[PDB]
């Protein structure tokens with residue numbers, strides 16, 4: 105119940121929401137069917153439009169007008185945004201030359217530059233170039249401020265997940281808004297675009313920026329605008345708030361435009377109909393900037409122009425139907441469209457089986473336009489699994505396509521020509537970032553970055569401490585003139601042991617054999633040197649990784665590689681080696697095919713054993729430092745140490761062997777040497793975070809050897825490829841991956857072919873940031889470089905995407 109009999113008199117767009125059943129006058133009352141009876145008449149005036157004209161200049165104030173052109177309007181804070189232009193001979197902001205804003209130039213009474221977030225729905229990154237002719241205000245913000253060529257959204261690339269990620273710095277699996285539509289089985293409740301359930305606070309996890317500000321004594325304008333409030337009225341409301349007394353005035357504001365997304369769905373991302381929506385958004389930016397200029401705020405406020413996601417060409421005819429794959433299509437519920445999520449239609453149905461559903465959806469049709477996954481097998485870069493609202497079965501839909509349950513859903517639910525929601529690496533899903541103001545840099549281009557990073561920066565702009573989030577704070581310091589955040593490296597928690605030779609070969613009873621008993625102070629002096637770390641500078645280029653949790657581990661040195669060997673997990677946490685452009689690939693000699701050698705620095709009790717591998721009929725083994733890249737026949741023996749061995753399914757060994765034998769040398773040739781760090785990852789609860797030992801669900805049969813869920817590699821070289829990876833004077837370049845350690849290659853539909861036709865494609869799908877590997881391993885990399893820590897933070901957030909040019 106709402107008693108709409110009260111009045112909005114003097115309350116129009118009031119900042120605090122009054123509670124039912126008293127009627128509301130805030131920018132959301134429409135959405136709740138709760139506004140006071142006179143809200144339209146008082147608060148949504150439209151009379152005479154939005155622009156001053158020559159004849160209105162100096163007019164008698166008529167309070168009925170949508171905005172004013174009378175002499176008192178500036179002090180009242182309610183002139184039309186073009187008042188000073190039409191009536192006082194001023195220029196539009198867009199027509200002014202840009203001039204660096206070295207310091208904030210604010211009216212007295214302002215404690216900090218305000219932040220205005222101007223968010224545009226469905227604004228594809230390429231609109232900045234492709235639409236530049238029709239967007240002069242936006243182009244001036246872009247060229248004069250700080251901009252990225254594009255900003256990467258989160259998955260799924262839908263409206264609510266991305267807006268709330270922008271507000272919180274959290275992945276959707278952590279903030280809880282994991283789609284535009286959701287079922288939460290614990291609540292037994294459904295979140296829908298239409299209706300009231302979505303207003304309930306239980307859906308919205310984390311701490312969005314307006315709450316962070318409010319808790320730290322910084323007032324916030326509301327971020328939500330009812331759809332029927334016109335854009336012009338939104339801008340005028342912001343401008344009026346900016347004229348409030350100091351004690352009442354917010355410091356952070358948001359504007360939201362439903363365009364260009366609205367038209368993009370109807371016309372496709374580059375339909376000729378799209379030019380007008382772009383022009384209209386630019387006019388709205390112009391209104392804001394002229395309004396700020398009138399208020400003497402245009403060299404005071406920081407403005408962020410940001411989108412949530414892009415827009416792809418998708419039509420009704422490009423739909424895959426599950427009814428062409430499944431016999432039992434009526435026993436499932438599908439969340440459909442540019443992603444799919446499947447669960448049982450009824451929890452009482454004991455014949456429902458996820459394994460048989462997945463198998464019926466796997467590589468069934470030659471050009472099939474979606475791929476099924478159990479959520480824990482999705483690429484770890486999507487961070488899309490640790491939430492009960494994410495169904496176990498997921499369909500990753502190819503760009504340009506939809507998935508639906510049955511044909512009748514597409515015609516009894518072509519209309520649309522555009523959509524979004526696909527994998528967040530897809531070029532068409534990228535979106536925009538521009539920052540303009542005293543706190544941002546002048547005429548500066550920054551590389552692409554992820555939208556999870558922005559919350560920390562918004563916090564920096566407002567002097568707020570950010571709530572715990574998934575950004576890496578400091579990685580966007582290069583966007584800022586001032587207010588940078590200068591973190592310190594995390595403290596190493598566990599120091600390594602440095603074991604020397606402590607065991608005789610006969611103490612080991614591992615069931616391992618090696619043909620190595622074939623026999624000089626010239627070469628015996630040299631091998632002692634190698635085991636003590638004499639080549640360590642060549643193979644450990646950025647310092648050893650720090651271990652950020654409590655554990656017991658050893659540093660092991662070798663001619664060709666160095667490792668941090670875990671006594672708890674019985675294998676390396678990391679193995680580091682450098683391969684020059686000149687390095688040669690050799691084979692595993694026939695006499696050495698099955699060779700495994702005890703490591704006389706490491707106790708039998710802290711070693712793997714070969715018998716467990718023999719007895720485990722599903723599990724084989726591989727090596728972290730590859731025997732193919734040994735520097736010499738004699739150095740190759742080091743590669744077969746029991747301490748370099750890790751468990752690997754035969755199907756995965758196909759992947760691993762091709763990476764090690766073919767791809768590493770290929771990267772060293774292309775990149776002028778590479779440094780490789782490889783290792784295992786254990787994430788059995790799919791939370792993106794390193795498992796403790798008691799979380800491990802699978803061991804090599806009969807042993808305490810834990811099976812990794814993933815294998816990673818971090819591949820670093822010099823950004824200036826004229827310098828070799830091991831003699832690099834300046835910035836670095838990195839690509840990394842986190843490969844799922846699976847007992848089949850069902851993910852790769854072409855896996856019956858030679859590895860040269862499918863392996864690198866799989867690896868590209870499982871591209872990762874160094875930071876993703878840090879979370880998964882509790883390791884901290886790049887501890888000793890010549891580089892600033894913020895620059896290293898940016899490097900750790902980099903993602904090599906393999907998409908062509910934007």
Ligand SMILES: *[C@@H]1O[C@H](CO)[C@@H](O[C@@H]2O[C@H](CO)[C@@H](O[C@@H]3O[C@H](CO[C@H]4O[C@H](CO)[C@@H](O)[C@H](O[C@H]5O[C@H](CO)[C@@H](O)[C@H](O)[C@@H]5O[C@H]5O[C@H](CO)[C@@H](O)[C@H](O)[C@@H]5O)[C@@H]4O)[C@@H](O)[C@H](O[C@H]4O[C@H](CO)[C@@H](O)[C@H](O)[C@@H]4O[C@H]4O[C@H](CO)[C@@H](O)[C@H](O)[C@@H]4O)[C@@H]3O)[C@H](O)[C@H]2NC(C)=O)[C@H](O)[C@H]1NC(C)=O
Pocket residue numbers: 274275277278279280306307308309310487490491492572573574791792793879
């Ligand atoms: C991205 O950044 C985020 C933010 O930093 C990272 O997420 C954090 O990770 C921490 C570890 O997983 C986690 O810390 C836990 O907090 C528990 C208390 O949590 C509540 O309070 C906080 C603070 O206000 C709040 O934010 C939480 O909000 C979550 O839950 C509600 C649902 O009720 C949601 O609305 C909200 O969206 C959010 O959900 C997300 O996180 C939860 C886990 O909290 C997931 O389950 C969801 O799927 C979703 O992803 C909560 O309201 C605290 O109780 C935990 O401590 C337990 O476990 C530890 C083990 O180390 C142990 O020491 C404790 O004793 C305790 O154990 C007991 O409980 C166990 C489980 O019930 C049980 O098994 C035991 O036997 C014991 O009884 C723990 O400290 C933190 O909550 C989240 N925060 C957020 C916002 O998600 C995230 O990791 C980053 N991602 C990456 C990849 O880096």
Ligand SMILES: COCCOc1cc(C(=O)N2C[C@@H]3[C@H]4CN(C(=O)c5ccc6[nH]nnc6c5)C[C@H]4[C@@H]3C2)nc2ccccc12
Pocket residue numbers: 221223225263264267268270271284297327328329358359360365
């Ligand atoms: C970002 O700065 C200001 C805007 O901030 C925010 C504004 C809004 C905010 O006010 N809205 C209005 C619209 C809601 C309903 N809706 C749709 O009808 C819709 C829109 C486009 C679609 N494309 N495909 N399907 C679609 C469905 C999605 C949400 C859009 C976001 N909500 C937010 C929720 C959380 C965090 C912030 C928010």
Ligand SMILES: [Ca+2]
Pocket residue numbers: 786787788789790791792793794795
């Ligand atoms: Ca884990």
Ligand SMILES: [Cl-]
Pocket residue numbers: 260262282283284285439
């Ligand atoms: Cl969704």
Ligand SMILES: [K+]
Pocket residue numbers: 717718719720721722723724
């Ligand atoms: K085996």
Ligand code: NA
Pocket residue numbers: 849850851852853854855856
């Ligand atoms: Na296959």
Ligand SMILES: [Zn+2]
Pocket residue numbers: 226263365366369524
């Ligand atoms: Zn949309």
